[PDB]
Amino acid sequence: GKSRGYRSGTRYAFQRDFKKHGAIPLSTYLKVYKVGDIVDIKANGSIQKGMPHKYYHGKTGIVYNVTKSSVGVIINKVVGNRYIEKRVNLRVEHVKHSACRQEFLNRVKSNAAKKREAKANGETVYLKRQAAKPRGSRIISTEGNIPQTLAPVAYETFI
Amino acid sequence: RKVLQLLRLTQINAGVFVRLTKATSELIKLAEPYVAYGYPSLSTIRQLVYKRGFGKVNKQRIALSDNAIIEANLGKFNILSIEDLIHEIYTVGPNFKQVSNFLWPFKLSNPNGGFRARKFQHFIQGGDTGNREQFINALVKQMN
Amino acid sequence: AISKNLPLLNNHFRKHWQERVRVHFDQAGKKASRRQSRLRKAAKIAPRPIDALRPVVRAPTVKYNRKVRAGRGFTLAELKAVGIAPKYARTIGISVDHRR
Amino acid sequence: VNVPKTRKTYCKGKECRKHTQHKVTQYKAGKASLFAQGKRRYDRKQSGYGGQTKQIFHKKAKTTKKVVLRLECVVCKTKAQLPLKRCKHFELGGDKKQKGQAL
Amino acid sequence: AKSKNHTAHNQTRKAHRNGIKKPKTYKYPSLKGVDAKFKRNHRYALHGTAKALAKARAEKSA
Amino acid sequence: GRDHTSKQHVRSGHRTAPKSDNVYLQLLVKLYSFLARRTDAPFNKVILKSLFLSKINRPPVSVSRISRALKQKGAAEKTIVVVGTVTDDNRLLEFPKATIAALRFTAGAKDRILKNGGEAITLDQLALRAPKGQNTLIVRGPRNSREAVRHFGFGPHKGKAPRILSKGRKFERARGRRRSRGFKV
RNA sequence: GGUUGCGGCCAUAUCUAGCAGAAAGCACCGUUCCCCGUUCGAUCAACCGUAGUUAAGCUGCUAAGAGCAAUACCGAGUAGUGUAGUGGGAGACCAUACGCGAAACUAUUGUGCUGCAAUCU
RNA sequence: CCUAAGGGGGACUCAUGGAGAACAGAAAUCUCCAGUAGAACAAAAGGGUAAAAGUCCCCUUGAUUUUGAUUUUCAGUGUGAAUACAAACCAUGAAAGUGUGGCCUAUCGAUCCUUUAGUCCCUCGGAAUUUGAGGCUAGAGGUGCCAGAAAAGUUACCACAGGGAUAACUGGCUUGUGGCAGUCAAGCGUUCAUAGCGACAUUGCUUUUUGAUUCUUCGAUGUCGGCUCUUCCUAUCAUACCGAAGCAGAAUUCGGUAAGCGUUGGAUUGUUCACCCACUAAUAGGGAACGUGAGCUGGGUUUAGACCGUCGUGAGACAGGUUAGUUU
RNA sequence: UUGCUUAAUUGAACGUGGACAAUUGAAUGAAGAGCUUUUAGUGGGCCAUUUUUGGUAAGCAGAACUGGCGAUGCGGGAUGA
RNA sequence: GGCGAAAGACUAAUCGAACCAUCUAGUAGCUGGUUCCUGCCGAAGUUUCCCUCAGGAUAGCAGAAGCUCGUAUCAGUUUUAU
RNA sequence: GUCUAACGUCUAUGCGAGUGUUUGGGUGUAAAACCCGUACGCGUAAUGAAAGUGAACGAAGGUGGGGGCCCAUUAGGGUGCACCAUCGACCGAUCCUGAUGUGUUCGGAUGGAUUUGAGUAAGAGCAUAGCUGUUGGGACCCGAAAGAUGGUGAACUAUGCCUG
C-alpha cells in the first residue's frame, strides 16, 4: 500500500530544533509584514493552523495579503514546462523576513553615498561590483622565515 | 554543455579569450574536462588575430582584413587598429569584454604533430584537458 | 470518438438513409415544364385571368400581427355586401371562403 | 454517538436570524409518491414486454448511513437539516457520561 | 502481462525544449484573494484620489 | 559537427508578401516596398508590413473609431490611415470633416465622409501628399472582438465561450456548470 | 552601580555544593470582620506594615565542578563527495587528476548581555 | 469512534525513583523530596504539546448561517481533506482573545431517480380557484472494481481474432538446488593430523538434477521411452606402464600418464529411474536440439467412445485407476 | 484620498510634487524577445556510467539523474542496437 | 425440426443445429497491406482519468500558419548576498 | 483515406450592420448565362429554471506600458490605434435594505454585497471557395467464430408403414 498524505515525509523537516521545543519567542508575533515584503518560509511544527504544505518549507516569496493572524505569500512553482503562481495563506509563526533585502538595500545606500561624495569632490567613482581578481605581484621576506625543506614520510602502522 | 555554449565553443577546435576572475574561473572549471586552455603570449595573440581573426558584424563572421572594419565597430571603445585590439586583449584592458565578444570564436585546425596518445585526461596526467599554461603556446603553434 | 475542443454534432445518419436520397437534378427541367404548363393554362382560358381574385387577411399569431397577406376566398358577408351570390361568384373569377 | 434532544443554533427563519432553542429529531425519509414523474416514467417503461428496463443495485459496500438531524425551531417552527459523520451506534438524548465512576 | 510502472526519464528533456520560462512580472498584480475589508475601502480611496487629481488639473487648465 | 544553440534553417515567421494574388494590392506593395527601403521614415515601414496582413489581422475600422481618434487633443486635422475596409456606423449622431485614406470604403462610409465635407482617398493618393506619412494617424480595428476568439483558451474556470451549435437550457448547463449538479467549472 | 515592576534575545542565564550581602527594594513574616476559596486562611481571598528576620527567597563570589558558549599551525586537508580516464585489480575494492570538504578527539577562553519606567547610603 | 474525546476559561502536573506511616506484604491509602516528560493525548505510526494540547472542575454548542478565495492530489479537472479572510449569529472569559468539529498528517462518493428542508418564490402555455404535478437552492438514500455496468457455471464436442506483448521442449544467462573438487587441520586411524580419512569453517568447478527467468519459436522446429547407428567428453569400471600403503605372499586400497580398446544376456515395469537372476576383465558416468518418428515402433502421455472411485444439484472435474483409439 | 485602522493629526494602500543621469548599480552569452491558434504521430521501450531495491544470482525484475540506442549512417572495438 | 437398440450419432463426401438466397460491404480495441521525387523541420513510449492492462481521452514532446514588437529582457551557466 | 451531411482553425474573395440571386418568379441562343423579390437563416443583446428584466458617473472610465504620429534641441515633452497587466463603471441572475403608495398584499424608489453569466463598455458579420482536423455513414482496402428472415432437400442415411 502506497501512502501520499499531506505531511508525509516531514518527520525531520517539521521537527523543532534540538533544545528549542515549546513556546514561541514573542518577536515572532511582534514582527510586522507589509505587502511586498520578501519572507522566508519555515513551518513551525507546534502551530498546526495556517501551516504551509511541505513544498513551501524552505521557500522564499512575496507578501500579497495581510489578515488577522496570517499573511498571503506568492510563490512560483514549476509545473511541467512553466511556472504557476501559488497563493499560500500562512500564519506569521511560519514566516520570517528574508535577509536578502537588507544586503541589497544597504548596497543601494552605499552607492548613493559614494556617488555624492565623488560628486562633492568633483571626481568619479565606480559602483559596479567585481568578481575576485587574480592577485598582483609581491615580495616575500625571508628574515625569520628561511624555507624549511619537507619530504614525504615513510609508511607506518599505528595500531 | 550550457557552459560551453555560453563560452561560444560549439565545435571542436574552437578558441576563445577569457578574462580571469571568479565567475569565469568557475565557468571554465565546469568545462575543464572538455577544453585545453592556458596563458597566451603576445606573439600567440598576434598570430591568432592576424591569421584567423574574424569580427561579428550584423551576426556575420567577417574577416579582419582592414582597420576600417575594426574602427567602424570598436571606435567607441578606442580601438582603431588590429594592434589596438591585440593590445587590449594581451594587457587585459577596460574594454576586454566588447573586444572579445566582437571577435568570432577562433576556428583552429588540428595539431600538426597530433595530440598526446590520449586526449581526454588532464594535462597533468599525460592527457590534454585542463590548464597547460605556457604550453598553450606550443599547442596553439600546433593548431594555428 | 470524442476528441479536441470541437462542437458536439447531431448528424442523423444511422438509418439506411442512402436508399432515400432525393437529388433535384431536374430543378431546371421542372422550372421549364412548369412554365410550359402555365402557358398552356393561359392559352386555354384567355382572356380570362389565370388567377382568381383573393381577399386580404391579417396573419395570425403575435409574430405576424403586423403583416397582412392574400387569403383564400372572400367571406359570404363580404360577397353579400357587393351583391354577389357565392355560387355565381365562383364562376366569375372570385374566390369564396365559407369558413372565414 | 449520543446527541441531546435540544440545541441552540442559528435560525435561518426570517423572523429569528439568531440562535434560538431547537428540538432535535432524527430525519426520516418520506413515503415515495406514485405520481412523481420519475416514478411515473419508471412504471410505464417496465410495462409490456422487455423485462427489467432499469438497473437494480447489488454491490453494497457501505455498512453505515449518515444520520441527519431535524432541527425544528421552537419559536417559528422552521426546520433545518444537519448531516453527521458515519456512525454505527446512535442514541438521541441518552445518558450523559459519568467520569470518575468505578468498574 | 506486466509492463513498465513509472519513469521520469526524458521528461526534463521535453520540458526544456520550449519551457522552463520564468513568469512575466507586471507593475500591478491582481488583487484576487486580497482582504475584502481592505479591498472594499481601497475602492473608495482610489475614486477619491482620482477626483482630487481631476480637480487639480481642471484648475490648471481653465 | 556543431552544438546548435538555436534551431537551424528557421523562417522568420512573418509575412514578406501578401498571400493575396490581387495585382492591385501588389502594386501598393510595390510602392511601399520602395518607400520603406529608402525614406528612414518609420511610417513607411509600418505600412509595408500592414499591407501583408491577412483579413483577420486588418479588422474593419468603423467610422466611429476614426471620430474618436480625431477627437484626441491636437489630432483634429490629421490624416486618418486605415489599411483595410472602413465601414459605416448608423449609431453615430454626427461626423466631422476629415481626410481618410483606406483600401476600401463602404457605400455608407464614402457617403458619410463626403457628406460632412471630408475626403475619401486611396493609399496611393496618400503617398503623394504625405510620402513620409507626415501628420498622419494610423487606425487599427479591434482584433479580440472576433467571434472565433470567444472560444480561444477554453477550460475550467476560464470564462470562455464553449464551442456549441445550439444555445438553451438543455445545452451544456447541468453538470460542470452548476453546484447543484455536482461541481461548477 | 544595587533593587523592584514590565520585558527582548532565550543556559555565557542551567545544575550541585559552600560563603557573603551596607542602603533601598523585594521577601519571609502577623491576623481572619469583610469579598473570596479550601479537608486544612497550606494555596487562593482579604486586613494590618502594626510584633519580628535576612534563616530562606533573591543577588554576588568561590569550584584543575557537570553542563553550556566561543575560539584554533588540535585532530585533518583525514572521512566523505562533485567531476575524469580504453587507470590498477579475477573480484572486493583501491590509487591518481581538477574541485568541495566533515564529525568525534585535543587544547584554550568565557559563565548573561541588554530595553522602558520607578527607586536607593 | 466521540454531546464530548468539540469550544472557552481556570486550577493543577504526568511516567518513574528515593525516604517514611496500624493491619499493609512485590501491588491498597497517606506525606515530603527529586522528577525535560523518561506519561498522557480514541485508534496505526510520525510530528506536536508542561503555570499545556496532559489531569480535574465550571459554563456551553462554533459539530451553526451566506457564499467566494486559496493549499494538496492536479489536466493545475473532479472528489476528499485542509488553510486565511469577508458578512452574520453566538459560546466562553475580567479581558485581550479563541472557537467555522475532533492537536496535525487517513477516516470516503457523480449523472438519472426518490425523499426531506428552504424560498412560500416561478410554471402547468385560452382565463381562474383549490388538490396534484413540475422547477430553483441545500442535505440524505450509493456506487469499496471506491471518476461511480444491472449479472452463475461447464465444454475431454467445440469455434474465431490474435499473441512468442504469455505458460507446456530444446537452446541462452544464473547455479540457489543437485553433482564433483580443493585449502586450514580439532579429531579418527593399537602409537601416529595428512597410508587411508577428516569436523567447525572457507575457496572453487560442473550444467547429466531441480529451480529462477521468459530472450527465440504460437500463418507449428512433431513435446515419453525403446530399437538401430555413428561420433565425441573424462569426473577411468576393465585392460598397458608406473608411484604410495597401516604393500610378507595372495588379495586390496590411494594416486600419475592415460578415452588406444571394450563395457553384456535376462524376469517384472510403457517407463527414464529402479530391483532381482547370471555370465564376464568390466558389466563406469555422460553429450551430440534431454542425438536419433519424411529411421521405425506407438506400450505411455494428451482429443473424441466407455467403466469405476472421489468431487459437483447439474452440465461436468480429477495433475486418480481402467479399456479402445489413422504415426502422411 | 478613504466608508479601512489608530487614543490620535496613528498607520495601510494608491497617489501629486521634488532630488538622485549613463559604472542606472556583478559575470558570460544571446541567428532577438514576447504572444496566439490549430493539428499529426506517440502513450509496449531498451541500454551505458554513477546512486539504488528484491533476489544466491541472472543477457532477471524494479527505481533516481544524465547521456545514448530506438530514429543513426561514418572511423575504431575481428565480429556486435 | 426430424430420426436415433443412444455414438452427440444419421439427416445427399455437410451435423454439439443441414443446404440455398437475403439482411450483409454484419462488427472487430486484433493480423496483413497501404502505389511518385526532392527540400526543411522533427518526436513519444511519460502525467491524470477510464471493466483501464494489446485500446482510448487528456497533458506533454512535433509541425504549420503566423502575430506584436526590435536589445526591449531573456538563459538546463557562473559570482556575491540570503 | 473516397464521396456526402453537419462542423473547428487558417487563408483568399465579394459586400458590410448587414449579408445570402438559384425554394420560387422572370428570361434564354434552354439543365448554362442573364435578371427579380417577399419571406426566411445567420448576425445586429444578454441573462435567468422561470415569471421576467434588459446594457454611458466620466470626453464610453482610471493607472503602467505601447507601434506610429506631433512639438523638440543629446536627452525631453505631447498624442497615443491594435494589444498586454491592473483597478473601476453598466446589463442579467443571487442575497441584503425596503420610499411615496396600496384591490393590505401588492409595489420596489433608494443604497449595498470575498457571489454569479457563453454579456455592455463607438458593432463584425454573412456568403462562396481551398487545404488540414472531427463525427455519422460500407467510411483506407481485405478478414471472423456468430445472429436474423424467407425458402430447398429422406436419390445417402435414421426410423415407421405398404408391396415384392
Ligand SMILES: CC(=O)O[C@@H]1[C@@H](O)[C@H](O[C@H]2[C@H](OC(=O)[C@H]3CC[C@@H]4[C@H](C3)O[C@@]3(C[C@H](OC(=O)/C=C/c5ccccc5)[C@H](C)CO3)[C@]43CO3)O[C@H](C)[C@@H](O)[C@@H]2OC(C)=O)O[C@H](C)[C@H]1O
Ligand atoms: C427491491 C430492491 O431492493 O431493488 C431495488 C429496486 O426495487 C429499485 O427500483 C426502484 C426504481 O429504480 C430506479 O428507477 C433507479 C433510479 C436511479 C438509480 C437507482 C434506481 O437509484 C440510484 C442508485 C443509488 O441508490 C439506490 O439504489 C436507490 C434505490 C431506490 C429504491 C426505492 C425507491 C427509489 C430508489 C443512488 C444513491 C441514488 O440513485 C440510481 C443511479 O442508480 O425507482 C422507482 C422509483 C422505485 O419504485 C423502484 O423501487 C421499487 C419499490 O421497486 O432500485 C434499487 C436500485 C434496487 O435496489
Ligand SMILES: C=C1[C@@H](O)[C@]2(O)OC[C@]34[C@H]2[C@@]2(C)[C@H](O)C(=O)C[C@@H](C)[C@@H]2C[C@H]3OC(=O)C[C@@H]14
Ligand atoms: C509441432 C510443434 C511445434 O510447434 C513445436 O515448436 O515444436 C514441437 C511442439 C512445439 C514446441 C517446442 C513450442 O515451440 C514451444 O515453444 C513449447 C513447447 C513445449 C512445444 C512442444 C511441442 O508442442 C506442441 O504442442 C506442438 C509441437
Ligand SMILES: [Mg+2]
Ligand atoms: Mg503491508
Ligand SMILES: [Mg+2]
Ligand atoms: Mg510507503
Ligand SMILES: [Mg+2]
Ligand atoms: Mg529541521
Ligand SMILES: [Mg+2]
Ligand atoms: Mg483543526
Ligand SMILES: [Mg+2]
Ligand atoms: Mg496551508
Ligand SMILES: [Mg+2]
Ligand atoms: Mg560614476
Ligand SMILES: [Mg+2]
Ligand atoms: Mg568570450
Ligand SMILES: [Mg+2]
Ligand atoms: Mg606529418
Ligand SMILES: [Mg+2]
Ligand atoms: Mg604523437
Ligand SMILES: [Mg+2]
Ligand atoms: Mg605532440
Ligand SMILES: [Mg+2]
Ligand atoms: Mg591517440
Ligand SMILES: [Mg+2]
Ligand atoms: Mg594509441
Ligand SMILES: [Mg+2]
Ligand atoms: Mg596548420
Ligand SMILES: [Mg+2]
Ligand atoms: Mg432554522
